């Protein structure tokens, strides 16, 4: 009965935090383990810098953004907005926070003031390895790129509006999907251009999460049908260059629909989840409602000449 309130995974993946009506808590994803309980209440949103001592979070006052410090139990800033805060990064450098429909981007230290004016936008944003992605405030289907060092690059990604962006590791890519769409787009952060584009066919249900390998191969997506599907932006393994006894040249080109879909097990009580690559072929998922991560594999198999989930751990998340 000590609900999370919030969870999120660090910058690089390898921790997960998160929040109750009574704590914080956070762990290492792989191998899973708990590294840190702190008691706190009211906690509704929590984040994490790399694996430092900062942690930021909010509590009963929605509009405030508490910058924390692990090890000396104190808070080192506070930071407030004129709306409830939404969308929340940080970084050695920024601190970007969402509210209405302004972002505004604070330092990472002393001062800890705005580091450039606020920017409007229509609901969707992220911020990875210095680079921002948000929705333009009129067109919801068209995003804004911008390099954060203290020109800009503009797409007209979707004609509805754009359900979530995913940066990729190297943040070189950004993949955009829109609301209830049937098409999953990938763009060039640089001058946007349009790389890769999914048909999710099938799969009709909305979108929870989409998430990136690590080296920027695979993508995966979760619908709330609860199934997994990952599509291939560019091919990993170190492939036979020949076929049918030397016959054939074997190309590997990425195809337009999903590589393999997986129908997750979960009970009547799900709210939602977030999911997470922790190599190139293998990925977590994280259940709220029961605290549990699970552990996936992506796998070729020859034998059917098709890619193959498995699901090689379930446990729960201690508090």
């Given at each position: 009965?000590?609900?999370?309130?919030?969870?999120?995974?660090?910058?690089?993946?390898?921790?997960?935090?998160?929040?109750?009506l009574?704590?914080?808590?956070i762990?290492?994803v792989?191998?899973?383990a708990?590294?840190?309980?702190?008691?706190?209440?009211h906690?509704?949103?929590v984040?994490?810098?790399?694996?430092?001592?900062?942690?930021?979070?909010?509590?009963?006052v929605?509009?405030?953004?508490?910058?924390?410090?692990?090890?000396?139990?104190?808070?080192?800033?506070?930071?407030?907005?004129?709306?409830?805060?939404?969308?929340?990064?940080?970084?050695?450098?920024?601190?970007?926070?969402?509210?209405?429909?302004?972002?505004?981007?604070?330092?990472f230290?002393?001062?800890?003031?705005?580091?450039?004016?606020?920017?409007?936008?229509?609901?969707?944003?992220?911020?990875s390895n210095?680079?921002?992605?948000y929705?333009?405030?009129?067109?919801?289907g068209?995003?804004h790129?911008?390099?954060?060092?203290?020109?800009?690059?503009?797409?007209?990604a979707?004609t509805?509006p754009?359900?979530?962006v995913?940066?990729?590791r190297k943040?070189?890519?950004?993949?955009t999907?829109?609301?209830?769409?049937?098409?999953?787009r990938?763009?060039?952060?640089?001058?946007?251009?349009?790389?890769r584009?999914?048909?999710?066919?099938?799969?009709?249900?909305?979108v929870?999460?989409?998430?990136?390998?690590?080296?920027?191969?695979?993508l995966?997506v979760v619908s709330?049908?609860?199934?997994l599907?990952?599509?291939?932006?560019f091919?990993?393994?170190?492939?036979?260059?020949?076929?049918?006894k030397?016959?054939?040249?074997?190309?590997?080109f990425?195809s337009?629909?999903?590589?393999?879909?997986?129908?997750?097990?979960?009970?009547?009580?799900?709210?939602g989840?977030?999911?997470?690559?922790?190599?190139?072929?293998?990925?977590?998922?994280?259940?709220?409602?029961?605290?549990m991560?699970?552990?996936?594999?992506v796998v070729?198999?020859?034998?059917?000449e098709?890619?193959?989930?498995?699901?090689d751990?379930?446990?729960?998340?201690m508090?």
């Open positions: 009965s000590n609900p999370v309130t919030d969870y999120e995974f660090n910058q690089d993946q390898s921790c997960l935090i998160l929040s109750t009574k704590s914080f808590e762990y290492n792989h191998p899973v708990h590294i840190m309980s702190q008691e706190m209440r906690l509704s949103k984040r994490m810098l790399h694996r430092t001592n900062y942690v930021a979070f909010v509590t009963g929605k509009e405030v953004v508490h910058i924390w410090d692990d090890v000396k139990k104190q808070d080192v800033s506070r930071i407030k907005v004129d709306a409830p805060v939404k969308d929340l990064f940080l970084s050695r450098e920024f601190i970007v926070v969402s509210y209405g429909d302004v972002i505004s981007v604070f330092k230290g002393n001062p800890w003031k705005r580091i450039t004016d606020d920017i409007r936008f229509g609901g969707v944003c992220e911020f210095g680079l921002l992605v929705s333009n405030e009129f067109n919801l068209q995003i790129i911008t390099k954060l060092q203290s020109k800009g690059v503009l797409i007209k979707h509805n754009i359900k979530m995913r940066l990729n943040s070189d890519m950004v993949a999907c829109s609301q209830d769409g049937t098409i999953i990938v763009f060039k952060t640089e001058d946007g251009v349009l790389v584009e999914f048909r999710r066919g099938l799969d009709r249900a909305d929870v999460d989409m998430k990136w390998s690590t080296d920027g191969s695979k995966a709330d049908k609860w199934t599907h990952v599509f291939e932006i091919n990993d393994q170190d492939n036979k260059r020949h076929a049918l030397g016959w054939i040249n074997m190309k590997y990425q337009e629909w999903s590589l393999c879909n997986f129908k997750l097990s979960v009970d009547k009580h799900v709210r989840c977030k999911i997470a690559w922790i190599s190139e072929s293998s990925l977590v998922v994280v259940w709220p409602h029961t605290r991560i699970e552990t996936f594999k070729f198999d020859d034998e059917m098709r890619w193959l989930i498995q699901m751990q379930r446990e729960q998340l508090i």
